[PDB]
């Protein structure tokens, strides 16, 4: 796991035990209001992040209710499963939605983090490309006021360095976690896909759990894809 401090320009490379202590520190710094610009490199095999760059019809943030976010989780999981990469059995994967604080001149954004589902970069690009054939996702975004529902998912989401939670550019404010969902898929019951909001998200180390390269989270336990 490699970390980039865009403020000090320095780079890092930590082990599991160290990372958690690294993330323990960063988490402390987060709950103290410190401004951070930490990025993690996705590498070639890690969690998935979807970066949505929204152009809006008005200058007000979309509502993005949990009912809508739950719908997007289902659609995103369909394209994940369609990549034919999930392992057999019953497994728990988590979706996290971090949102831009405010709409600025009609521009808005949100990130969908599935940090525990470790997969290859080629698999991520296939899912990202497949997610743009999805008329249901486009309609959902359209009903939210998004002016570019056909071109809002950044194709480089599979390779761009990913901001750690609480980090931002020296000019911008960091994205804020709105809610997170728990999805359970079972190869012995493929039609059953329960999606529910995670209980007590605030009780976890958010920097650690949402990390795409972390494998020692408490809530987010890794599920390795083919
Ligand atoms: Mn963005
Ligand atoms: Mn982008």
Author numbering: 47 to 272
Can you quote the paper on this entry?
Here, we report the structural and biochemical studies of the highly conserved C962R protein of ASFV, showing that C962R is a multidomain protein. The N-terminal AEP domain is responsible for the DNA polymerization activity, whereas the DNA unwinding activity is catalyzed by the central SF3 helicase domain. The middle PriCT2 and D5_N domains and the C-terminal Tail domain all contribute to the DNA unwinding activity of C962R. C962R preferentially works on forked DNA, and likely functions in Base-excision repair (BER) or other repair pathway in ASFV.
